[PDB]
TrEMBL record, chain B:
SUPFAM superfamilies: (Trans)glycosidases
Localization of this protein: Cytoplasm
Gene name in the database record: nagZ1
Organism lineage string: Bacteria, Pseudomonadati, Pseudomonadota, Betaproteobacteria, Burkholderiales
Keyword Cell cycle: yes
Pfam families given in the database record: Glyco_hydro_3
Protein's organism: Burkholderia cenocepacia (strain ATCC BAA-245 / DSM 16553 / LMG 16656 / NCTC 13227 / J2315 / CF5610)
Signal sequence coordinates: none
InterPro entries, per database record: Beta_hexosaminidase_bac, GH, Glyco_hydro_3_N, Glyco_hydro_3_N_sf, NagZ_Beta-hexosaminidase
Protein name: Beta-hexosaminidase
Length: 333, 325
């Protein structure tokens, strides 16, 4: 069994036979979890264990950014700050902010690993122009140099627990505000600021989600369906070698009239390694069985699995590094 | 469970005497030097043979780059002196951080390919332009720049599953050598990287330096430095390795352990080291053992032939070649 290109979700808090059929399909490569999949840690750990038991090579992901985007916020999960808080701390004390960003990343990753999750779709690398409500306080800072070094520090924390990362929403969701948002800036302007964190992070950036945004002076296709953005800019100009995950194909406007299967095919043809189909598993199953569409993608997908062993909760709760990180978060924020 | 002593093996092939020492309950590690390296095949056979005797062994080396890099041939990348990264930082801060991570990734990945757990790097000593022994091994004069460059390097090491070890605590930059500064002065600058790195700092080697205003004992033998300052004030939870005790020997090892070292280094005299193994009084705390185990490399590593064809490794090589030219 090798991972397929589709990341989908399960129906409940324990696996059903229909879930197990979808998990076994060759075109399935991942599961994304939402708040509805979480009752408490024991239930979540049993759920992810059962998913891996069906499909050993599956990737399990969640949206854990902190602040407004954090699916699990109860039964011992630490409620993490909005990333904007880390930018505000930086504006007072740069070095302390980098230390706190790493503590946040370590806590975030260690808690997820304790429940058997591979990765979080974080960091947001969108710049805080103040133009985008949907991004808002999810952005670290206005300045792309600051976004880079704070996100790098966060990603270092994630790496200390063996977890990768995923920068979003490429090439930048910060400027446009919503049909899909349109950003009418020149390519050179977008590259100068919004793309700079992707370029500067180098090996510290493991993956990208492209924005459901149309950059009207660059390509009429939204970024996740754009060979210009994904190949010419990201793989070509930037030499990026990590995984590319589409944003949710369930966002109707992003498909430009296409079905879920046509949009999945288009995203993979443009350069996504994996496509997300959220909140409609039967429709995801139509995609699994209808997809027209890689060894190169498989390598990148496999590299998103968490690395090494992780502490279960019953050990994490006693670990000096975890406890140190918790104390720092409390004091510095 | 790993013991507290890190020692060297005699040569390029394990001997019966080495095997007897490796099996001693008080052994926890091997440190490798340039004399242990003929070529990659020999080195990998050596580290395999070490782990075959003692499964829980930690295998370490001094790979800093520049003047301190034991393995430089048969495909090993000759890495820059850390000063070069500070110089690049003065030109372009963001590029320097990217390059530091590429250097750390290359450094760790090549060592992992040969079965080594860790490198004793980064040097956190500040470049006051005073210490010849440190010299171009220091990143920078500014403790903020040392912190962020060392952090970026440590991130690269972490991407290959490798830890790190900051040295030489509380600071070798100003100075057995003596350092006559106040405790406050030493904390203000030299100690700052240890504090700011937080979880990005995995371990520490204390300096063989006497800080005369603080303690008559060198830092590795000082419960003031190790307990009151490092464990206490900074809240540091990582491993502490003595610097080489070869620089009774058993009493020195016991003193360093009692002061706060989790592991002691005894280099370049395996017979004397065996006396230490058999005479040592120290009983490691459970926390000490946990710290030592956490220094082992994490996850799977690529073998050499796979590594050199890996896109990320190739990207890191291309960046080093272009940015440091």
């Amino acid at each position: 069994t090798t991972p397929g290109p589709v990341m989908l979700d399960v129906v409940g808090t324990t696996l059903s036979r229909d879930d197990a059929r979808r998990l076994a399909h060759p075109n399935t490569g991942g599961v994304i979890l939402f708040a509805r999949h979480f009752q408490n840690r024991a239930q979540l750990t049993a759920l992810t264990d059962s998913i891996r038991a069906v499909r050993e090579d599956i990737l399990i992901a969640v949206d854990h950014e902190g602040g407004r985007v954090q699916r699990f916020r109860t039964d011992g999960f630490t409620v993490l700050p909005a990333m904007r808080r880390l930018g505000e701390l930086w504006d007072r004390d740069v070095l302390l902010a980098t230390k706190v960003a790493t503590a946040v990343g370590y806590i975030l990753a260690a808690e997820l690993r304790a429940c058997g999750i591979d990765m979080s779709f974080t960091p947001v690398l969108d710049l805080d122009y103040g133009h985008s409500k949907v991004i808002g306080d999810r952005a670290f800072h206005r300045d792309p140099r600051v976004v880079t070094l704070l996100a790098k520090s966060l990603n270092h924390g994630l790496s200390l627990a063996g977890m990768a990362n995923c920068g979003k929403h490429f090439p930048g969701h910060g400027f446009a505000e919503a049909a899909l948002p349109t950003d009418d800036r020149t390519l050179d302007a977008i590259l100068e600021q919004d793309v700079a964190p992707y370029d500067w992070l180098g090996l510290s950036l493991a993956a990208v989600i492209p924005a459901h945004v149309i950059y009207t002076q660059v390509d009429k296709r939204p970024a996740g369906f754009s060979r210009v953005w994904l190949q010419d800019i990201l793989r070509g100009k930037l030499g990026f070698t990590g995984a590319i995950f589409s944003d949710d194909l369930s966002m109707e406007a992003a498909r430009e009239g296409g079905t879920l299967t046509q949009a999945a095919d288009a995203a993979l043809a443009a350069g996504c390694d994996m496509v997300l189909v959220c909140n409609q598993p039967d429709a995801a199953e139509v995609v699994l069985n209808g997809l027209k569409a890689s060894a190169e993608s498989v390598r990148r997908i496999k590299r998103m699995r968490a690395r090494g062993k992780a502490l279960k909760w019953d050990k994490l709760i006693a670990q000096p590094e975890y406890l140190q990180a918790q104390a720092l978060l409390s004091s510095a924020l």
